[PDB]
């Protein structure tokens, strides 16, 4: 394919199917890029990563961690061009992640709990559905999440499952925290120290949850494990972030503010991520 | 060779060459055990037996021997023609043999002329760094802790004396007292942990904490084969198999936040960027 097609293909993956994660949408356009791309050799390896950056259209961290993991595990090899069969394999495997997670979580959501969440998260929606429809009664609190009000969107989705839900202002997280039992949040990216990059506002929610001793749980797919090691907001690359005005789309939450992470790799405490991440990136 | 035999070989390996890091002696006996070992039907069966002695080389309970050992076994891994593991094993040793000196020179920039350097115990890697610096004709002074219970800092003071370098031996209880007189501290590591922190001879943690409070840079010098797959966040998370032999642990742990920079054979690194090197390391396969 060519740049044009690439983006057009990518954008038309999440638009007709928002259900899908950007990361997953990125490797799909990448399978087609590869497939639809014929005629090489290292040209393939280079022309493929030289366009994976192009999918940067989505400043999403997952596009970056996803692309690498996908790329790394198909490069192991025009007969060698059977990397495609590994791509279908990989895309076939990552499309089971949400589920392993919603399963590793049915236990922590106890009957009668009050969950506090931030913005929209597909994985979070899944976990709660697999809990409600799974004979559990709870209520949720979610921040409206400026600037795209994705929190309201989340709310509506929760209402459709007839789960009691209240929307509050981002400014009201420390106000509503005392009436929460636990907070569940998704991640755009899990960094090498067990911390996470997520929709701006995630950080302060964690700081408040900790001061009130409320467990903070993160629910996210392993293909979100990215090779970055930030220690503060300043370390997060601008590339993922975007009288004066500052509009960071995401922020970083240190691992000490996280209780547990639920991944298709199993439930992990922040200090276990680094070893998993490597034991993940290095797989044949 | 067997256990009794392995240990014998491993000890004499270091007796004959005291200047040799315990981690290199261990991997050398593993190579020797690789050659000397035969009787296949172990295509991957002895890939276990060679581990059944990775442990045995616990006659020296240092993390180095472990992270190094795992590196070796990881590197020499790809028909009994497979004893190409041996020649790979010889390539590896050949490789991790230019580490000390490479670090020594890839580190001369930071040894200012006229400086007062405070170090702890004995580290052959720190010794090569200063030797390099002296040959480079830099004039500096050194303070070293005797480092109980084996007093290995005194052996270090002698080595520096026979190098005509001004060195003063102090009590371990004296690091707080002497800190103000130093420009920087330079220490070695038995193991570099996944978060950029390190495991080193007991006493290291204190020095790092005392150096932080007076803003004296804290530098670590260590070979890459010491990058170990561990992520401790406190003394408790360090395994006892690396501590013993309270009851007198031989090593304490120093958080990354107490480390200014690490000078490795892969170059100078900030503690935070270390975990990525471990991946980049193994990616070398």
Curated annotation (Swiss-Prot), chain B:
Biological processes, Gene Ontology terms: cytoplasmic translational initiation; oligodendrocyte development; response to glucose; response to heat; response to peptide hormone; T cell receptor signaling pathway; translational initiation
Q: Which residues carry this modification: N6-acetyllysine?
A: 35
**Which SUPFAM superfamilies does this UniProt record tie to the protein?**
NagB/RpiA/CoA transferase-like
Q: Which UniProt keywords apply?
A: Acetylation, Cytoplasm, Disease variant, Initiation factor, Leukodystrophy, Protein biosynthesis
What are the recorded GO MF terms, alphabetically? guanyl-nucleotide exchange factor activity; identical protein binding; translation initiation factor activity
Q: Where are the transmembrane segments?
A: none
InterPro entries in the cross-refs: eIF2B_alpha/beta/delta (IPR051501), elF-2B_alpha_N (IPR042528), IF-2B-related (IPR000649), IF_2B-like_C (IPR042529), NagB/RpiA_transferase-like (IPR037171)
Which cellular compartments is it found in?
Cytoplasm, Cytosol
Q: How would you summarize its activity regulation? A: Activated by the chemical integrated stress response (ISR) inhibitor ISRIB which stimulates guanine nucleotide exchange factor activity for both phosphorylated and unphosphorylated eIF2.
**Keyword presence, Cytoplasm:** yes
- Where does the protein principally reside? cytoplasm
**GO CC annotations on file:** cytoplasm; cytosol; eukaryotic translation initiation factor 2B complex; membrane; plasma membrane
Task: Say yes or no: keyword Zinc-finger present.
Answer: no
Cystine bridges: which residues?
A: none
Family classification: Belongs to the eIF-2B alpha/beta/delta subunits family.
Q: How does it assemble?
A: Component of the translation initiation factor 2B (eIF2B) complex which is a heterodecamer of two sets of five different subunits: alpha, beta, gamma, delta and epsilon. Subunits alpha, beta and delta comprise a regulatory subcomplex and subunits epsilon and gamma comprise a catalytic subcomplex. Within the complex, the hexameric regulatory complex resides at the center, with the two heterodimeric catalytic subcomplexes bound on opposite sides.
Family matches, as PANTHER family = TRANSLATION INITIATION FACTOR EIF-2B SUBUNIT ALPHA
The entry's function note states: Acts as a component of the translation initiation factor 2B (eIF2B) complex, which catalyzes the exchange of GDP for GTP on eukaryotic initiation factor 2 (eIF2) gamma subunit. Its guanine nucleotide exchange factor activity is repressed when bound to eIF2 complex phosphorylated on the alpha subunit, thereby limiting the amount of methionyl-initiator methionine tRNA available to the ribosome and consequently global translation is repressed.
What is the disorder linked to it? Leukoencephalopathy with vanishing white matter 1: An autosomal recessive brain disease characterized by neurological features including progressive cerebellar ataxia, spasticity, and cognitive deficits. Brain imaging shows abnormal white matter that vanishes over time and is replaced by cerebrospinal fluid. Disease severity ranges from fatal infantile forms to adult forms without neurological deterioration. The disease is progressive with, in most individuals, additional episodes of rapid deterioration following febrile infections or minor head trauma.
Task: State the protein's name.
Answer: Translation initiation factor eIF2B subunit alpha
Which organism does this sequence originate in? Answer: Homo sapiens
From the UniProt record, report the name of the gene that encodes this protein: EIF2B1
């Amino acid at each position: 394919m060519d740049d044009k097609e690439l983006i057009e293909y990518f954008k038309s993956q999440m638009k007709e199917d928002p259900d899908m994660a950007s990361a997953v949408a990125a490797i799909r356009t990448l399978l087609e890029f590869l497939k639809r791309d014929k005629g090489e050799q290292g040209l393939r390896a280079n022309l493929t990563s030289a366009i994976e950056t192009l999918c940067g259209v989505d400043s999403s961290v997952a596009v970056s961690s996803g692309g690498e993991l996908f790329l790394r595990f198909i490069s192991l090899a025009k007969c060698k061009k059977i990397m495609i069969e590994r791509g279908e394999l990989f895309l076939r495997r990552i499309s089971l992640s949400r589920n392993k997670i919603a399963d590793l979580c049915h236990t922590f959501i106890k009957d009668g709990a009050t969950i506090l969440t931030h913005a929209y998260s597909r994985v979070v929606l899944r976990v709660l559905e697999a809990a409600v429809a799974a004979k559990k009664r709870f209520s949720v609190y979610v921040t409206e999440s400026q600037p795209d009000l994705s929190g309201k969107k989340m709310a509506k989705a929760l209402c459709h499952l007839n789960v009691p839900v209240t929307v509050v202002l981002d400014a009201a997280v420390g106000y509503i925290m005392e009436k929460a039992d636990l907070v569940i949040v998704g991640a755009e990216g899990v960094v090498e120290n067990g911390g996470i990059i997520n929709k701006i506002g995630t950080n302060q929610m964690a700081v408040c949850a900790k001061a009130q001793n409320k467990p903070f749980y993160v629910v996210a797919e392993s293909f979100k494990f990215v090779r970055l090691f930030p220690l503060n907001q300043q370390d997060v690359p601008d590339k993922f972030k975007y009288l004066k005005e500052e509009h960071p789309w995401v922020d970083y939450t240190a691992p000490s503010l996280i209780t547990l992470l639920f991944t298709d790799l199993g439930v992990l405490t922040p200090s276990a991520v680094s070893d998993e991440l490597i034991k993940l990136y290095l797989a044949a």
